[PDB]
């Protein structure tokens, strides 16, 4: 009940949309995906570090909005996450973060991943984080196709998560976010 360390996060890009999904332990509240207006961050690894990073980034994004008088964009948030991670060069957090979003002014989808000290991996297709399943990357590679519609993208990412769950069982669930320029949809998967 108190063991929540680990998990997986999958981010994918479609046509004018993005998808970010994470696993969840259900059965008989702790989600690894957070948002800061229109930028979504999913963190895998040590749970205490995940909570710490979420609190710190909420702090920094609130101050940023108060000062700039506008919401932060995915690229700026990516750079902020990188610098914050690098601050702890010799005591780094045991985390793997993934960022997804849509730029407001341009409308371009954006996804990125980070290492534990902030090295940025900007991918045009998809990002997989976590070590729960080694075949999850292969399944995502076999299922992904460029320029998918939001319904097709949701189906693809949901199928990837379902197959990964079947690979490794009771109480498993998923949370999926489909993000457009002006609409965000959050769905739960109990399969």
């Amino acid at each position: 009940p108190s063991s929540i360390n680990g998990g997986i996060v999958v981010a994918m890009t479609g046509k004018d949309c993005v998808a970010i999904a994470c696993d969840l332990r259900l059965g008989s509240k702790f989600e690894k995906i957070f948002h800061y207006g229109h930028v979504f961050l999913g963190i895998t690894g040590l749970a205490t570090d995940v909570t710490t990073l979420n609190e710190m980034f909420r702090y920094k994004t609130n101050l940023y909005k108060l000062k700039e008088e506008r919401a932060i964009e995915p690229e700026t948030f990516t750079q902020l996450v990188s610098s914050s991670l690098y601050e702890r060069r010799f005591g780094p957090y045991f985390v793997g973060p993934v960022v997804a979003g849509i730029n407001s002014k341009s409308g371009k989808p954006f996804i990125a991943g980070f290492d534990l000290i902030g090295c940025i991996d900007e991918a045009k297709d998809f990002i997989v984080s976590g070590t729960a399943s080694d075949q999850l990357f292969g399944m995502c590679e076999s299922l992904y196709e460029p320029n998918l519609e939001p319904e097709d993208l949701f189906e693809t990412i949901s199928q990837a998560l379902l197959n990964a769950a079947d690979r490794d069982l009771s109480g498993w669930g998923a949370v999926v976010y489909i993000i457009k320029k002006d609409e965000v949809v959050k769905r739960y998967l109990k399969m």
Binding site: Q135, D166, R167, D168
Partner: protein, 250 residues
Amino acid sequence: MQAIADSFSVRLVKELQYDNEQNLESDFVTGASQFQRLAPSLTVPPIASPQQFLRAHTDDNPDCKIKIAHGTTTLAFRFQGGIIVAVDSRATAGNWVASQTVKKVIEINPFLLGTMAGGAADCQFWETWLGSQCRLHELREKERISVAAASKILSNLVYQYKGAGLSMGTMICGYTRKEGPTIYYVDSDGTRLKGDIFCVGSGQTFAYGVNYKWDLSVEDALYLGKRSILAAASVNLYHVTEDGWIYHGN
């Protein structure tokens, strides 16, 4: 005397290490005697610490790790109708597709069953060898071997190699006219324990809730074994009588 002369008459064969009969047999130079040994020959590294060498080189990237048997719950118990053996059949997943159902119970002969735990290869190899030994014994004595004798043979075998690296835990179950039904547990530490009820693997405490009496019918015993496995958690069921083992499946 001329054999001595040949021994002192001449390099290449010495470097090939083929002047030793064991090396020639192992490489099938002089025939197939290597596949004709009742007691298998096991290679060891010619160093001062073979055990440390093996332990270091086994506890470390590709798929070339030694396969470990399922830690799933297995139950065996005895009643007036024979023996009930129940195994939680939930095969693991990997980079392969199974052609048929994977058996976690080794059929030593049409009258003996064994259970796998620890090293899968050790259990399979040594239980097949035990089946060969039992067949030879039955041919010699013109009578079915007792469960105690077979369990003792396996225990002595594993004790001769104790500490080398073998890892196995098995339950030998059999029904003979003289002994009735009998269950022994034998592990790689040399322990040989006769018993009435055995629960091995994860969830053994839950499965040990066996409602147990020596008057249960066959159907009642099968249902009790199935329920115990479900409480521990499909279930594979075996009913061992004097005429052999019968596989039910559930």
